[PDB]
A paper describes a structure:
Previous studies suggest mitochondrial ABCB7-type exporters are involved in maturation of cytosolic iron-sulfur proteins. Here, we report a series of cryo-electron microscopy structures of a eukaryotic homolog of human ABCB7, [name], determined at average resolutions ranging from 2.8 to 3.2 Å, complemented by functional characterization and molecular docking in silico. We propose that [name] accepts delivery from glutathione-complexed iron-sulfur clusters. As anticipated, the architecture of [name] harbors the classical ABC-fold, packing into a homodimer with six transmembrane segments (TM1–TM6) in each monomer.
Next, we determined a single particle cryo-EM structure at an average resolution of 3.0 Å, CtAtm1inw-opn, exploiting wild-type protein without supplementation of cargo but in the presence of ATP. The computed maps display well-resolved TM-domains, while the resolution of the NBDs is somewhat lower, and hence we are unable to confirm the absence of nucleotide binding. Nevertheless, de novo building of almost the entire structure was possible (580 modeled amino acids), with the exception of the first 94 residues in the N-terminus that includes the signal sequence for mitochondrial localization, and the last 26 residues of the C-terminus, likely related to flexibility of both termini. Thus, the configuration is distinct from the available structure of eukaryotic ScAtm1 and hABCB7 (PDB-ID 4MYC27, 7PSL28 and 7VGF26, RMSD 4.2, 3.8, and 3.2 Å), in which the NBDs interact via C-terminal extended helices in the S. cerevisiae structures. As such, our structure is more open, exposing a large cavity (>7000 Å3 as calculated using the software CastP3.0 with a 2.5 Å radius probe) that spans more than half of the membrane into the TM-domain. The cleft is decorated throughout with electropositive amino acids and is partially blocked at several levels: (1) at the matrix-membrane interface through the Asn395 pair of TM6 (one per monomer, conserved among eukaryotic [name]), establishing an “inner” gate (the first from the mitochondrial matrix), and additional residue pairs closer toward the mitochondrial intermembrane space that firmly links the TM6 pairs. Notably, these amino acids also divide the cavity from Asn395 into two separate, symmetrically related, parts. We propose the inward-open configuration represents the resting state of eukaryotic [name] proteins, in which the protein exposes a highly electropositive cleft to the inside of the mitochondrial matrix, as detected in the CtAtm1inw-opn (and E603QCtAtm1inw-opn) structure.
Numbering used by the authors:
A (entry chain A), B (entry chain B): 95 to 674
Amino acid sequence: AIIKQMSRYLWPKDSWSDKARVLLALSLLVGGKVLNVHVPFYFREIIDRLNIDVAAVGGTVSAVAGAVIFAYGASRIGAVVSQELRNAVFSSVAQKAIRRVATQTFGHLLNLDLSFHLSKQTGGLTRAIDRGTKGISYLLTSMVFHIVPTALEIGMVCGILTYQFGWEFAAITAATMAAYTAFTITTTAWRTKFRRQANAADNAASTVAVDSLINYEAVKYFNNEAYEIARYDKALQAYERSSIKVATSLAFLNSGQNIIFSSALTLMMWLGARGVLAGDLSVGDLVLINQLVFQLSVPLNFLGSVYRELRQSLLDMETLFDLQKVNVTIREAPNAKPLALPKGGEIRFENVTFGYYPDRPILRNLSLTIPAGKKVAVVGPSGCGKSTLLRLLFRSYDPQQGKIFIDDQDIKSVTLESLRKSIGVVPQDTPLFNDTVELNIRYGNVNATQEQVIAAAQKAHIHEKIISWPHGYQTRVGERGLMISGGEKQRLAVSRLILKDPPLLFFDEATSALDTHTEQALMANINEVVKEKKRTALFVAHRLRTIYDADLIIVLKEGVVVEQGSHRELMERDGVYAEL
Amino acid sequence: AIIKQMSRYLWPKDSWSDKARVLLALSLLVGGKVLNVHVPFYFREIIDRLNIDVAAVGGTVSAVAGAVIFAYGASRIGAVVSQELRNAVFSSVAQKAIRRVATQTFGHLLNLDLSFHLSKQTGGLTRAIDRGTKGISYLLTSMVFHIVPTALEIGMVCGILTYQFGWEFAAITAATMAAYTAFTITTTAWRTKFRRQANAADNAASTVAVDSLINYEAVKYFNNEAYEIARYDKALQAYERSSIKVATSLAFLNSGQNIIFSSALTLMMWLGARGVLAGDLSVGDLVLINQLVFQLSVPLNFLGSVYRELRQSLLDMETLFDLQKVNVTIREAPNAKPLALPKGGEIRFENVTFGYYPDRPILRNLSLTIPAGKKVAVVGPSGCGKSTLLRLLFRSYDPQQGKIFIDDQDIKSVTLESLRKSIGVVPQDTPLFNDTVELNIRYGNVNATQEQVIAAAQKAHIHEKIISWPHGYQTRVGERGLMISGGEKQRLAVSRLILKDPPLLFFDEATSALDTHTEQALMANINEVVKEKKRTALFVAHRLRTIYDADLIIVLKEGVVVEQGSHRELMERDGVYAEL
C-alpha cells in the first residue's frame, strides 16, 4: 500500500554513505544475476569448444577450452559471492533504517502526554515497536534478498532464451514460474491447517500426560492406571494421525513442485533436441537451456513463507506508523517565553475545574494561592483529588476551564520544558529503574558528577545505607535487583530532588509507607532540605498529623477550597490521630 | 552409543506391518538414489545421441533421442517422488515407534511408587517424555531422511566416477564432501556465538525500551527524555553491531561452501576436458561428471543443524530411557493370593515404626486394631502423623519394621491390586481432573453406566447442585473449568467412593474445608453412607468435635497408641471446642 513507500522512500535514503550502500547493494544484486546467467554460457562454451575432431585439431586443455573452464568456475564463485555480499550490505542498510525508525518512534512515545500512557497496556507499546521493526526487517529483507533477485533473474532468463532460441522457450519458462509459484502458494496455504492441527493434538496429548501425572494419588486410589494409559494412547494416536497428514502434505508439496519443474526441463529438452536436429542449435545449447531454467529453480525456497508473512509484516508496519501518527493533546503555546524563575515563586489558582472523563469533575471551581517563598500543605480525605494537583500543575493534564498562574503568567503560555524544569516532584510510588543506585540518584541531574551524588545522598541520609549494601553504590536495585523497603525508595526520590535543585517543590504523599517512625524521619529530613534556601514547598498528605507543623494549611473538601489556617484551628476536622 | 541400538532395534522391529513399512522405506531410499544417479546418465545419453551429423543421419526426435529424453524426465520425477514417499513412510514408522515408547514409559511412571512422584518436580516428567520423544523423532528423522541417503549417494557417485572415469574423480568427490562437511560443521559451530549475542543484544534493547516506558512519569518529572532516547539508541547500536556479525558470518558460510564446491566442479571439468581431448571420454561425459557432483550438492542443507542436535537428542533419549530404568521400591510378593474380601474386614497393626527419611520415625512402635464391621476413628494434634496411615495401609509406603494384618494375613503378601481394590479413599485435598463432572464422578468405577453415576451423585446429595450448573453434569470443572468450593470437591470424592463400593473405607480429613455447617452436612451424609451396609469405616480428623459420634475412638499421641474409648471420656484432652 502506501506503507511501503512510507518506509522505503524515507529511511533508506537519508545521507550519502547510506545511499552509497544502497547503490552498492543494487549493483551487487545486478552483478550477481549477470554472473549467474553467465554460468551456463561458459559451460556450453566448454561443451562446444571440446566438441571438435579430437585426433586432428585437439591439442591440449588451456589452449582449447581453458579460458572458459576458468570463467565457468569464476562466474559460479562470483555469482554466489555477490549474493552473499549483497545480503550483508543490505542487512547493514536495513538495520540502520530500523534503528532510526525505532528511535524516532520511541522519542515520539516519550513526547506524548500522560493520558496516552495511562490508556495503553504498558509493555504493549514495546511489543508494537518490536513487531513493527521486525515487520520492516522482513519486508526489506524479503524484498531485496528474495523477490527482486528472483524476478530479475526470471526476466533475464526469459530475455536470453528469447534472444537466442525463440519466444517459446520464454513462454515455457514464464509458465513454469507462474505454475510453480501458484502451486507453492496454494498448497502452502493448504498445509498450515495440518501443521496447526498437529500442534494442537500434540498439546492435547501432553496435557493428558500432565493431567494424569498431577493426579497420581487419585490414579492409584481408584486403580485407574490402565484407563489413563488408554487415554494417553488415544491422545497420542490422534496426534500421529495429524502428523501423518503433515508429512504426507509436505511430500505432496515437494513432489508437485519438482513434477512441475521437471516437466518444464523435459519439454525444453524436447524443443532443444528438435532444434539440434534442424541444424539451428548445438548440443551445448541444450545444456544452456537446461542449466538456465534449473538455476531459476534454486532460490525459490522463500515462496512458502512469503505470502502470509508480508501480510503480517504490513500489518505490523501499519501499527508502528500508526503509533507515529498519534498527536499530543497538550499544545505548547507559540512564542512561549521561559519566565518567572528569578521571581519569588508563587502559584495562583483561579476558578479551575478538572476531571478525568470531564462529565464528572474532580476539582469543582477551585481557587487557591500558594504564597511566595513559603511552605504550604493541602490535605483532604483519601480520594478528594489532592493527588490530581501535580498533574494539573506539572501540566501533564490540562484544565478544562480556568487558568493557572506561576508569578503572574499562565502555565499555558510558558515554554513547557522550562515549566517542567522549574517543578520538582517526589511522587507517591517512586519507581526504581532496573539499574544501579548511582543511576537512580543521578537521574535528578544526569550531568552531575560523582561527589555531587555523594553529597546528595548525604543530604538525604542514605550514605550509610548504601555503603551498608554489598556492592556499595553500584548495587543492582529495582525489580530484578536488591529489593528494598518503600521508605528507602522515597528517600532516593528525595535525593533526586536535591540533585535537580528546582525552584518549586512538591512532596505528593512523600511519606506514605508502613512504619510511622520512618515517615517521621522522612518528614524531618525533608524539613531541613526545605528550610533556609527559599524553596516554595508544597505538600500533600492524607495524614494531617504528619504535616501538622506546616507554615500554611489549605484544606480541600470535594473539589473546593473551604478554609485555611494552622495546626490546632484546623485539627478540629475528622480523621483525628486519636485512634493512632 | 548403546542408546541408538536400544531404540532402533526394538521399537521399529515389532510386528509384520511395521517391518514391512520399514522395508518399504529402505527400498524407496535405495530406489530414489538409483534414479537420482540415473538422471545425469540419461542427460549425457541425450547429449551423445544428438551429437551426430545433423544433415546426414539425424532424422527426427523420438527416433534419435526421445526415449532418453523421457527417461531423463521420468528419472528426475521418480527420484524426487521416491524421496517424498520415503519420508512419508518413515515418518509413519517413527511416529508409531514414538507412540509405543511414550505409552510404555508413561505406564511405567504410573507404575512407580509414591516416593518417586514426591521426589520429582511435577510437570518435569512430562517434559522428559516430550523431549525424549522429540529426540527419538529427530534421530530417526535425520538418520533416514538426511544422513543415510546422503552417505549412500556419496558412495554411489564415487563408485560410478571410479568405474567410468578413474579413481581421481572419486578422490576429488570424496575430498569435496569431506571439506564441505568440515567447513559447514566448523563455521556453523562458529556462527552460534554471533546468533546468541545478537539475541542477547536485541533483548537488552527491548528491555531498555520497556524499562523507560514503565517509568514514564519519572522520565517526564526529571526532564530525561533525551537521555532515555540516547540510552535506547545506544542499545540499538549495540544490537545492530551484532546483527552485522550474524549476516556477515552467514555470508562467509554460504560463499565458502560454494567456493569449495565450485572449485570441485571446475577441477573435474578440467580433468574431464583432459579426458575428452585424449579420446577417452566424450562431451556428454563432462555433463555426467558435472551433474553427478552437483546433485551431491543439493541435499546438504541438513549439515548446519545436525551436529549439535543429534547430541541434544541423544541426551534427551538418555533421560527418557533412564526414566524407563527406574525400579519400584515396593515389591509385590511372589505367588500372592487375593484374600479376606469375604471375611469381616478387620485391620490389625503390630509394632510398626514408620518414618519418611527413616532416621526420624513418625510412628513409634505403634499397634492398633480396627474391629470388623465397625466405625473407628483415629485423632491427634495437627502433625502427629494420622495422615500417614493411608499411605502405610494403602501400601504406597512400606513399614520399616513391623507387620500389617487385614483379617489375619499380611498386606505384604496379598496381591497389591486386590489390596488397592479393597481400600476406599476420601483424601484430604481431592484433586479434580480438567474434564467433566461426569468423569470426575465416574472415576470411581469407569465401567459403571450413566444412571449409576446419577444414583451415586444422588446418594451424596449433589444432584441438585450439578443440575444447578449451566451445562448440567457435562460441566467443564477443574483448574481450567468452573471453579468450585472445597466442600463440593469433597462431596465429589464421596460420590466416587460410592461408585467404587469397596469393603474398607477411609475418610482421611474428609471434612476440612472452611464453613462448619458444610462439614456437618458432609459428616451427616457420610454417616448415612457408612451405616447399614457393614462398611468397616476408618476416620481421621484433627477436629474431634466433628467425629464425636464415632463407635470407637483411638488416639495417637506422638506415634503411640495411648487410650481408647468414647466421646465424653476422651473429650478430656486439650484442643477442646470451647473456643469454637
